[PDB]
Design an enzyme around this catalytic site. Structure first.
Site, PDB file in Angstrom:
ATOM      1  N   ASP A 102       1.001  -1.286   0.031  1.00 35.07           N
ATOM      2  CA  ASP A 102      -0.087   0.190   0.029  1.00 35.07           C
ATOM      3  C   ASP A 102       0.957   1.257   0.132  1.00 35.07           C
ATOM      4  O   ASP A 102       0.212   2.452  -0.035  1.00 35.07           O
ATOM      5  CB  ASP A 102      -0.787   0.075   1.224  1.00 35.07           C
TER       6      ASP A 102
ATOM      7  N   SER B 140       2.160   6.745   0.559  1.00 31.65           N
ATOM      8  CA  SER B 140       1.524   6.281   1.415  1.00 31.65           C
ATOM      9  C   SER B 140      -0.187   6.327   0.945  1.00 31.65           C
ATOM     10  O   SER B 140      -0.645   7.413   0.958  1.00 31.65           O
ATOM     11  CB  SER B 140       1.347   6.574   2.953  1.00 31.65           C
ATOM     12  N   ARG B 141      -0.744   5.091   0.523  1.00 24.94           N
ATOM     13  CA  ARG B 141      -2.058   5.325  -0.176  1.00 24.94           C
ATOM     14  C   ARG B 141      -3.009   5.414   0.782  1.00 24.94           C
ATOM     15  O   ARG B 141      -4.323   5.989   0.606  1.00 24.94           O
ATOM     16  CB  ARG B 141      -2.380   3.913  -1.093  1.00 24.94           C
ATOM     17  N   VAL B 142      -3.076   5.006   1.804  1.00 24.47           N
ATOM     18  CA  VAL B 142      -3.770   5.308   3.239  1.00 24.47           C
ATOM     19  C   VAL B 142      -3.976   6.670   3.459  1.00 24.47           C
ATOM     20  O   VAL B 142      -4.768   7.285   3.598  1.00 24.47           O
ATOM     21  CB  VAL B 142      -3.464   4.417   4.377  1.00 24.47           C
ATOM     22  N   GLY B 143      -2.761   7.392   3.776  1.00 29.97           N
ATOM     23  CA  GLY B 143      -2.614   8.791   3.836  1.00 29.97           C
ATOM     24  C   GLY B 143      -3.150   9.210   5.176  1.00 29.97           C
ATOM     25  O   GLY B 143      -2.931   8.506   6.188  1.00 29.97           O
TER      26      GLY B 143
END
Lengths: 183, 273, 134, 37
Positions: B112, B137-140
């Site tokens: 991710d 970071s794709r969650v962010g």
């Protein structure tokens, strides 16, 4: 090989970064120079108004640059190409009237007589265009012997001497500002 | 290294099963695979000695399937399924920064996000050598607290502006005042991000120090003393203004009243600094 | 209705502005300029330029030195090096400048160059004090 | 006057006059008007 292409690509990318950084520095310096030229241009027009009204027509060469006819250079570029006076450590700072005063003082206190002269400088045409031209410069004796100077009142030797000293300084300042903006 | 290649192939799955026990029991677990490139090498040797058809760099046709079935077991379970979680931190060792190699490409496409450590930044003494422009970071900001997300959005924007304007202004002097302000702010933030080894420092002190970084509080101090500011100013708010920290912890964010209180505290500390 | 251009390296004050009258302090004496005044040239002295705008407003500008050029077309081009508004002046700094100038005159002794510098600074100090008081 | 009689041109006189001119401004215009040499 792949490594040779990668090394060459990295080198050209570094060259592009350097040229873009110098472009940004030159853009900031040009913006500052244009901001000063917007003020310094009517001052030069007012200085040239006297010679335009008197219509003085007809030597000396003042070559504006950065780092039988007598040629005086302002900058290291003319000395690199080619020398009564050479100005060093110039171009890192914007020009001021003190520099034009020093240049005009060195020209007039050199002890060399001159009748007519020109200031070879790069005038500012546009952002992408600049034109190398000259501005006529006359001495005290070339002004006192003129036909129209008899119509100008309250003129002794001291007044005309002081006037041409400051008028030469103002013209050198105006050419320095236009040359700096053009460069 | 002295252990057999099957043991190196099996160890990430053994550790994943140990973590998944905590995940399925309602607990939370964090697992580190240090490193997955050695497991891929071990599986490559086993697959070559088992007369399997190889592919790119003599890796088999299911190294991607190997790492994907390993790393898909890290999950946040639902509240009806227990509510537990397993967090994976795989490690990839690259050679001369070759991101486009086969195994790093697979692991990057699986996870991710990535945290890039740079050899150039490490040899400059910038530790930790995290490359901000390459770290994703794709969650962010969904994976942040309210206060941290509030300050890190402005910090990320200012660091992006500094990264944009510092490429062409490495040593330029005749520049605009805005460019010099961005350069100074980015230098303060970059010196703020530096951290020693074996010293985690909790979420409250991190939020406080980068809040001081983004509000222009550190523009009047030298960057070399910024770490010394971290050594002292947090201790000051641990001994003089604990009520401000208590109100911040109670509200969860930074109100403008707490903004004024913290501005007064910073000004008082910098007067005696 | 006189085209009065008043510029400097630092600022540009008027650019072909129509002005009724300008009171120039020159080296040939402080003289006033009106439309079609005379075709003279002049050399400025440390003093005060008084400008009469077309609405009747009167403005003042201290000039250190420059050139005055009244042409046949009633156009005036006063070009000082450092022309400031008289409202932007310091009287205390003027008195300190004049006192230091007199000190340099006293301490010059046989140095004719520093004597000329002291005399010039005395003139500027007197003009600055008179402009700040005026 | 004595300016030209002491082997001094007018340009040096303007330099001396302006150098004694930029100092007659206390609060903020002293630094703005000065453009070094």
């Amino acid at each position: 090989t792949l490594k040779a292409v990668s090394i060459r690509l990295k080198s050209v990318k570094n060259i592009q970064k350097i040229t873009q950084s110098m472009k940004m520095v030159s853009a900031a310096k040009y913006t500052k120079a244009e901001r000063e030229l917007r003020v310094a241009k009517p001052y030069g027009q007012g200085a040239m108004k006297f010679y335009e009204k008197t219509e003085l027509k007809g030597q000396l060469i003042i070559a504006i640059s950065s780092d039988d006819t007598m040629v005086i250079c302002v900058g290291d570029k003319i000395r690199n190409i080619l020398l009564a006076m050479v100005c060093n450590d110039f171009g890192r700072r914007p020009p001021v009237f003190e520099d034009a005063t020093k240049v005009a003082r060195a020209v007039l206190e050199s002890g060399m007589e001159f009748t007519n002269g020109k200031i070879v400088y790069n005038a500012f045409r546009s952002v992408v265009s600049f034109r190398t031209t000259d501005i006529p410069v006359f001495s005290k004796n070339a002004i006192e012997s003129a036909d129209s100077i008899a119509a100008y009142d309250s003129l002794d030797s001291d007044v005309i001497q002081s006037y041409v000293e400051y008028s030469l300084a103002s013209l050198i300042y105006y050419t320095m500002k236009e040359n700096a903006t053009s460069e | 290294a002295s252990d057999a290649a099957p043991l190196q192939y099996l160890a990430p799955y053994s550790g994943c099963a140990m973590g998944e026990f905590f995940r399925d029991n309602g607990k939370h677990a964090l697992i580190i695979y240090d490193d997955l490139s050695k497991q891929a090498v071990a599986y490559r040797q086993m697959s070559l000695l088992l007369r399997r058809p190889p592919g790119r760099e003599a890796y088999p046709g299911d190294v991607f399937y190997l790492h994907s079935r390993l790393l898909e077991r890290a999950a946040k379970m639902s509240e009806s399924n227990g509510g537990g979680s397993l967090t994976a931190l795989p490690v990839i060792e690259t050679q001369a920064g070759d991101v486009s190699a086969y195994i790093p490409t697979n692991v990057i496409s699986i996870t991710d996000g990535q945290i890039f450590l740079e050899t150039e930044l490490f040899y400059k003494g910038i530790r930790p050598a995290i490359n901000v422009g390459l770290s994703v970071s794709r969650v962010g900001s969904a994976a942040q607290t309210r206060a941290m997300k509030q300050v890190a959005g402005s910090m990320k924007l200012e660091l992006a502006q500094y990264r944009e304007v510092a490429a062409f202004a490495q040593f330029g002097s005749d520049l605009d005042a805005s460019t010099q302000q961005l350069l100074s702010r980015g230098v303060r933030l970059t010196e703020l991000l530096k951290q020693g080894q074996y010293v985690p420092m909790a979420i409250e002190d991190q939020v406080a120090i980068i809040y001081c970084g983004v509000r222009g509080h550190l523009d009047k101090v030298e960057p070399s003393k910024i770490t010394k500011f971290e050594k002292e100013f947090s201790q000051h708010i641990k001994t003089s203004h604990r009520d401000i920290l208590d109100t911040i912890a109670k509200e969860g964010q930074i109100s403008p009243d707490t903004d004024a209180k913290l501005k007064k505290v910073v000004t008082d500390f910098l007067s005696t600094f | 209705q006189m085209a009065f251009t008043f510029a400097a390296p630092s600022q540009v004050f008027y650019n072909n502005a129509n002005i009724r009258q300008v009171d120039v302090p020159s080296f040939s004496g402080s003289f006033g300029i009106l439309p079609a005044h005379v075709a003279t040239l002049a050399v400025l002295k440390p003093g005060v330029v008084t400008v009469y705008q077309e609405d009747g407003s009167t403005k003042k500008y201290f000039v250190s030195s420059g050139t005055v050029t009244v042409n046949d077309d009633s156009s005036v081009q006063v070009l000082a090096e450092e022309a400031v508004p008289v409202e932007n002046l310091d009287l205390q700094a003027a008195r300190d400048i004049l006192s230091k100038a007199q000190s340099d005159v006293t301490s010059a002794g046989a140095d004719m160059l520093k004597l000329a510098e002291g005399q010039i600074a005395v003139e500027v100090g007197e003009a600055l004090v008179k402009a700040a008081e005026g | 006057s004595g300016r030209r009689g002491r082997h001094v041109d007018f340009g040096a006189s303007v330099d001396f006059e302006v150098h004694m001119m930029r100092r007659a401004l206390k609060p903020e215009l002293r630094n703005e008007a000065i453009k070094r040499e």
